[model samples]
Target chain A: ETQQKVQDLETRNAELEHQLRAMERSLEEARAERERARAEVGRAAQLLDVSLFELSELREGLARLAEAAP
Target chain B: REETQQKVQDLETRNAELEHQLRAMERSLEEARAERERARAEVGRAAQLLDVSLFELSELREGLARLAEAAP
Candidate 1:
């Protein structure tokens, strides 16, 4: 009966090893997905800033012309 | 059997932590996507405003030019 219990432990240990490898792979994929999502957000925010800045400058320029260029 | 039990328990805890981390990462990704959508909408509005502002500048310039052409 003790030998049988030892064999069961060994089988479970093998299964644990397999589970660990699978878990590691899943973690790796999650990290990569997160990185890509972060990069996309960064790019989008940058474009938003630029668009707002350009709009600000042009609006100011229109006023400058109204006051002086006329 | 006792050592194997300990090993099993250790791995179970590790698996739980790993699952927790993945859930956290998924939440982070969701937040990032939401922020990106917000940024995208802002950009669309800003670009439309820029186009309208550009048209206003052109209109002002044409008006001033017309005034100059009419003057002696």
Candidate 2:
């Protein structure tokens, strides 16, 4: 019957909608993780750059002091 | 009916692909986080060592300054 066919298709459509919603939530979570990783990597890179600069300055200062010594 | 069936099948395939992509993104994010953590720790350790070295150098400089000041 056409009525039975319509009911089946409606059911299938509903199921697909539910699944799509779940998939969307998972996609959002995955996207959030990517963003978090990006932020952390950026922060870590900045810290590393600062540390490297300080280390360079210390080494240069020590070398200059040594050279100036009699 | 046939059209509805095909649509359902197509959506199912698309859903599967999206799920696969989500999994791949999760893995990539995990790897990136791990690498960042390791690099951050190494930089932290390097900074600590540099701090100690700077402290020692400053103390030496202070002593030299005092010695020069006290000399006739």
Candidate 3:
């Protein structure tokens, strides 16, 4: 005996195809997530570089103030 | 035979994808490590600066003490 198609076979196929498209969409979302993570990492790196410059200047200012004291 | 060949191809593709993901994770880890090291260096610099300033203050106070003792 063969596995006969049910009365609602066409409807079920349509639903399954829609789910497959959803899976493809989810994969694209995962790819976008990786890209966003990369951009954040780049921005963080820039912040750190600027922080180093500012910290150095602050340290120099404190030194000058101490040296000027009596 | 066809099913076996199809399964082998699927495994190969999955393996390649996994390898690519692993490389991305490794790059992310390397960048994170670099960021952490930069932060560590800044902390060390701050601590050293504080220690030196405190030492200078103590020296200044000692000088004041000597000057006061020599005064009338």
Candidate 4:
């Protein structure tokens, strides 16, 4: 009975260790994917801002021309 | 066993949050793509109209020059 109880405890300990390692691996991959997604968002936002500025300048130039015309 | 369970639970919660953040980032990317498309259309229209405006001004300049030449 004593040896059987020790064997059961060792088995449970091994299972927990395995589960912990798997969870840690999954978390690492999730973090890496998130970082890549974040970088893409940053690049896209910069492009959007550039185009917005260009549109503004074009509209302003057109307006000035219209106002200056007879 | 209790300590291992706690560690695993902590990581699970963190992983869930990371997934949530990734979903939000994907939505943000989608929005940015749509915004880029709209801005590109605006640029195309502006360029076309500016092209037409400049062409008209050029034609007008030629007409004015001819009139001035004919004047005293």
All candidates: TM-score:
0.49, 0.48, 0.43, 0.49
lDDT of model 3, residue A29:
97
DockQ of structure 3: 0.00
Worst 10 residues of 3 chain A by lDDT: A61-70
Give the runs in model 1 whose Cα sits over 4 Å from its true position: A1-70
- Reference A-B contact fraction recovered by candidate 1: 0.00
Quote the lDDT for A10 in model 1: 96
lDDT score, residue B53, model 3? Answer: 66
**What's the residue-level lDDT of A21 in candidate 2?**
100
Clashing pairs in 1: none
Q: Looking at model 3 chain B, which ten-residue stretch has the lowest summed lDDT?
A: B63-72
Decoy 3 TM-score against native: 0.43
- Candidate 3: count the clashes: 0
Off by over 4 Å in 3: A1-70, B64-71
DockQ of each: 0.01, 0.01, 0.00, 0.00
- Pairs that collide in candidate 4 are none
Give lDDT: candidate 3, residue B64.
Answer: 44
* Candidate 1 local lDDT, A14-59, one digit each (tens): 9999999999999999878766666565555555556656776776
* Candidate 1 chain B, poorest ten consecutive residues by summed lDDT: B63-72
